Write a protein that holds these residues in place. Sequence first.
Motif, PDB file in Angstrom:
ATOM      1  N   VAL A  51       0.717  -1.289  -0.099  1.00  0.00           N
ATOM      2  CA  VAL A  51       0.075   0.004   0.123  1.00  0.00           C
ATOM      3  C   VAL A  51       0.881   1.220   0.084  1.00  0.00           C
ATOM      4  O   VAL A  51       0.864   2.291  -1.042  1.00  0.00           O
ATOM      5  CB  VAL A  51      -0.854   0.167   1.313  1.00  0.00           C
ATOM      6  CG1 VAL A  51      -1.657   1.543   1.195  1.00  0.00           C
ATOM      7  CG2 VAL A  51      -1.924  -1.152   1.249  1.00  0.00           C
ATOM      8  N   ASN A  52       1.821   1.252   0.896  1.00  0.00           N
ATOM      9  CA  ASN A  52       2.598   2.532   0.986  1.00  0.00           C
ATOM     10  C   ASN A  52       3.528   2.560  -0.179  1.00  0.00           C
ATOM     11  O   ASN A  52       3.986   3.603  -0.503  1.00  0.00           O
ATOM     12  CB  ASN A  52       3.576   2.296   2.226  1.00  0.00           C
ATOM     13  CG  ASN A  52       2.733   2.640   3.580  1.00  0.00           C
ATOM     14  OD1 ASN A  52       2.652   1.710   4.647  1.00  0.00           O
ATOM     15  ND2 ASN A  52       1.987   3.806   3.650  1.00  0.00           N
ATOM     16  N   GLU A  53       3.945   1.399  -1.040  1.00  0.00           N
ATOM     17  CA  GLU A  53       4.836   1.678  -2.126  1.00  0.00           C
ATOM     18  C   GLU A  53       3.966   2.404  -3.324  1.00  0.00           C
ATOM     19  O   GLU A  53       4.521   3.217  -3.750  1.00  0.00           O
ATOM     20  CB  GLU A  53       5.188   0.290  -2.487  1.00  0.00           C
ATOM     21  CG  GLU A  53       6.440  -0.197  -1.716  1.00  0.00           C
ATOM     22  CD  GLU A  53       7.675   0.638  -1.693  1.00  0.00           C
ATOM     23  OE1 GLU A  53       7.594   1.719  -2.466  1.00  0.00           O
ATOM     24  OE2 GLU A  53       8.741   0.362  -1.393  1.00  0.00           O
ATOM     25  N   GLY A  54       2.666   1.752  -3.470  1.00  0.00           N
ATOM     26  CA  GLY A  54       1.732   2.311  -4.149  1.00  0.00           C
ATOM     27  C   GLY A  54       1.559   3.925  -4.156  1.00  0.00           C
ATOM     28  O   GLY A  54       1.596   4.795  -4.940  1.00  0.00           O
ATOM     29  N   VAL A  55       1.512   4.250  -2.696  1.00  0.00           N
ATOM     30  CA  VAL A  55       1.130   5.754  -2.471  1.00  0.00           C
ATOM     31  C   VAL A  55       2.387   6.385  -2.870  1.00  0.00           C
ATOM     32  O   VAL A  55       2.292   7.334  -3.714  1.00  0.00           O
ATOM     33  CB  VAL A  55       1.008   5.901  -0.855  1.00  0.00           C
ATOM     34  CG1 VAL A  55       0.938   7.330  -0.474  1.00  0.00           C
ATOM     35  CG2 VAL A  55      -0.234   5.300  -0.512  1.00  0.00           C
ATOM     36  N   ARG A  56       3.468   6.088  -2.496  1.00  0.00           N
ATOM     37  CA  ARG A  56       4.772   6.744  -3.012  1.00  0.00           C
ATOM     38  C   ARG A  56       4.904   6.876  -4.353  1.00  0.00           C
ATOM     39  O   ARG A  56       5.201   7.831  -5.046  1.00  0.00           O
ATOM     40  CB  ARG A  56       5.880   6.123  -2.303  1.00  0.00           C
ATOM     41  CG  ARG A  56       7.459   6.297  -2.919  1.00  0.00           C
ATOM     42  CD  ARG A  56       8.284   5.343  -2.475  1.00  0.00           C
ATOM     43  NE  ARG A  56       9.742   5.507  -2.810  1.00  0.00           N
ATOM     44  CZ  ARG A  56      10.769   4.389  -2.985  1.00  0.00           C
ATOM     45  NH1 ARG A  56      10.246   3.214  -2.634  1.00  0.00           N
ATOM     46  NH2 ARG A  56      11.905   4.807  -3.526  1.00  0.00           N
ATOM     47  N   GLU A  57       4.740   5.627  -5.192  1.00  0.00           N
ATOM     48  CA  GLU A  57       4.921   5.521  -6.553  1.00  0.00           C
ATOM     49  C   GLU A  57       3.774   6.566  -7.002  1.00  0.00           C
ATOM     50  O   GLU A  57       4.465   7.304  -8.022  1.00  0.00           O
ATOM     51  CB  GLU A  57       4.501   4.206  -6.869  1.00  0.00           C
ATOM     52  CG  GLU A  57       4.762   3.973  -8.482  1.00  0.00           C
ATOM     53  CD  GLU A  57       4.375   2.512  -8.788  1.00  0.00           C
ATOM     54  OE1 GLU A  57       5.213   1.592  -8.245  1.00  0.00           O
ATOM     55  OE2 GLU A  57       3.542   2.296  -9.575  1.00  0.00           O
ATOM     56  N   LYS A  58       2.570   6.627  -6.813  1.00  0.00           N
ATOM     57  CA  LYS A  58       1.914   7.357  -7.577  1.00  0.00           C
ATOM     58  C   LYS A  58       2.011   8.994  -7.231  1.00  0.00           C
ATOM     59  O   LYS A  58       1.725   9.719  -7.837  1.00  0.00           O
ATOM     60  CB  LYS A  58       0.222   7.093  -6.860  1.00  0.00           C
ATOM     61  CG  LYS A  58      -0.723   7.932  -7.370  1.00  0.00           C
ATOM     62  CD  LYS A  58      -1.088   7.849  -8.632  1.00  0.00           C
ATOM     63  CE  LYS A  58      -2.053   9.084  -9.042  1.00  0.00           C
ATOM     64  NZ  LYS A  58      -1.728  10.264  -9.079  1.00  0.00           N
ATOM     65  N   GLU A  59       2.735   9.192  -5.887  1.00  0.00           N
ATOM     66  CA  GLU A  59       2.851  10.482  -5.581  1.00  0.00           C
ATOM     67  C   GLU A  59       4.121  10.967  -6.425  1.00  0.00           C
ATOM     68  O   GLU A  59       4.398  12.273  -6.684  1.00  0.00           O
ATOM     69  CB  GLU A  59       3.142  10.738  -4.155  1.00  0.00           C
ATOM     70  CG  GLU A  59       3.780  12.281  -3.754  1.00  0.00           C
ATOM     71  CD  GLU A  59       4.150  12.285  -2.306  1.00  0.00           C
ATOM     72  OE1 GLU A  59       4.985  11.195  -1.663  1.00  0.00           O
ATOM     73  OE2 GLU A  59       3.448  13.069  -1.666  1.00  0.00           O
ATOM     74  N   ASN A  60       5.128  10.125  -6.612  1.00  0.00           N
ATOM     75  CA  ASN A  60       6.408  10.361  -7.412  1.00  0.00           C
ATOM     76  C   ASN A  60       5.970  10.696  -8.848  1.00  0.00           C
ATOM     77  O   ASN A  60       6.513  11.678  -9.542  1.00  0.00           O
ATOM     78  CB  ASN A  60       7.454   9.368  -7.504  1.00  0.00           C
ATOM     79  CG  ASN A  60       8.313   9.287  -6.004  1.00  0.00           C
ATOM     80  OD1 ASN A  60       8.220  10.197  -5.382  1.00  0.00           O
ATOM     81  ND2 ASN A  60       8.928   8.266  -5.734  1.00  0.00           N
ATOM     82  N   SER A  61       5.199   9.908  -9.624  1.00  0.00           N
ATOM     83  CA  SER A  61       4.968   9.966 -10.883  1.00  0.00           C
ATOM     84  C   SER A  61       4.008  11.238 -11.194  1.00  0.00           C
ATOM     85  O   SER A  61       3.574  11.579 -12.391  1.00  0.00           O
ATOM     86  CB  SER A  61       3.912   8.694 -11.323  1.00  0.00           C
ATOM     87  OG  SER A  61       2.541   8.999 -10.680  1.00  0.00           O
ATOM     88  N   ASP A  62       3.661  12.030 -10.205  1.00  0.00           N
ATOM     89  CA  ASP A  62       2.976  13.266 -10.214  1.00  0.00           C
ATOM     90  C   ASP A  62       3.846  14.216 -10.326  1.00  0.00           C
ATOM     91  O   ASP A  62       3.810  15.699 -10.099  1.00  0.00           O
ATOM     92  CB  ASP A  62       2.031  13.614  -9.073  1.00  0.00           C
ATOM     93  CG  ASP A  62       0.636  12.841  -9.300  1.00  0.00           C
ATOM     94  OD1 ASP A  62       0.296  12.228 -10.276  1.00  0.00           O
ATOM     95  OD2 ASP A  62      -0.015  12.679  -8.398  1.00  0.00           O
ATOM     96  N   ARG A  63       5.247  14.108 -10.796  1.00  0.00           N
ATOM     97  CA  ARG A  63       6.368  14.854 -10.931  1.00  0.00           C
ATOM     98  C   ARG A  63       6.911  14.712 -12.310  1.00  0.00           C
ATOM     99  O   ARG A  63       7.743  15.336 -13.056  1.00  0.00           O
ATOM    100  CB  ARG A  63       7.435  14.544  -9.971  1.00  0.00           C
ATOM    101  CG  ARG A  63       6.964  14.702  -8.637  1.00  0.00           C
ATOM    102  CD  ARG A  63       8.232  15.074  -7.585  1.00  0.00           C
ATOM    103  NE  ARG A  63       7.914  15.157  -6.343  1.00  0.00           N
ATOM    104  CZ  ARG A  63       8.839  15.751  -5.213  1.00  0.00           C
ATOM    105  NH1 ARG A  63       9.672  16.276  -5.685  1.00  0.00           N
ATOM    106  NH2 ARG A  63       8.329  15.448  -4.041  1.00  0.00           N
ATOM    107  N   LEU A  64       6.312  13.730 -13.075  1.00  0.00           N
ATOM    108  CA  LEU A  64       6.683  13.441 -14.530  1.00  0.00           C
ATOM    109  C   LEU A  64       5.608  14.145 -15.457  1.00  0.00           C
ATOM    110  O   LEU A  64       5.006  13.033 -16.288  1.00  0.00           O
ATOM    111  CB  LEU A  64       6.953  11.966 -14.569  1.00  0.00           C
ATOM    112  CG  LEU A  64       7.736  11.394 -13.679  1.00  0.00           C
ATOM    113  CD1 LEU A  64       8.078   9.714 -13.993  1.00  0.00           C
ATOM    114  CD2 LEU A  64       9.185  11.870 -13.879  1.00  0.00           C
TER     115      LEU A  64
END
Length: 278
Positions: free
Chosen positions: A265-278
């Motif tokens: 769950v936490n990986e998904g959150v981080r992933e999704k939040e990181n991709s909002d920089r691309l």
Amino acid sequence: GSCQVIGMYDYTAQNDDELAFSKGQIINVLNKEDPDWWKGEVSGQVGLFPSNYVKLTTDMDPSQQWCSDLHLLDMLTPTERKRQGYIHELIVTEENYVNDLQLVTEIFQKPLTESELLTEKEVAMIFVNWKELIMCNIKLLKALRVRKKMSGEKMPVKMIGDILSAQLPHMQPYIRFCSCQLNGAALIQQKTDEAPDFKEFVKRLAMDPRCKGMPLSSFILKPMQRVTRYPLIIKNILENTPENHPDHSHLKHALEKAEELCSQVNEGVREKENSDRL
């Protein structure tokens, strides 16, 4: 280290630098320097208080908070009592949790999918697979209820790990919901800023007495909260289950499935939040 304590007696402050509290009141402990005078805070007010007038909450028997009415409770070993206590913290908070999910749909989701005050997509962006969560958790709840029934009305439950071990695998829909709740939260704020019809409607929805005053922006945080909570409760149950116990192995397996669900769950959150920089 920060922790809670409950007042075991009333106490009136005897000096300006003291904290007065009533029996039963929980106070947040800021420090335990002086082994006789803890620094505490209650409602933003800080003061010193007699450490002998209080009881750490972590020192309280969990069966006393979650199942004080369990039959034969007083006959059980101190360690089986804690085991029953944590098992019931799991079951009680699940009932609490599932019902809150249901509550959100009844008084927030449907009333918004009809509001037409926002698109069909704007509803998905906020509630995402919320309905999906209600489904896999209702399944868990029903399974726990059955075990509870199987055991005898207010009778100690002997097994629990098997159900958790079995039930946790279907919790996969959480990865998606938790990963998207970040935007859903932004969405709700954007609308409640641009759409005056929105701010008002959702303000009316939230005054349902069952909300106890909690805005939808906080109810939406519950799925994450529940996911991170599971490991904690399961570990406490495991710790009070000896290795020769028939549930021990399942509990060990369940703790594991729970810890990784939380990781995923936490990986998904981080992933999704990181991709909002691309």
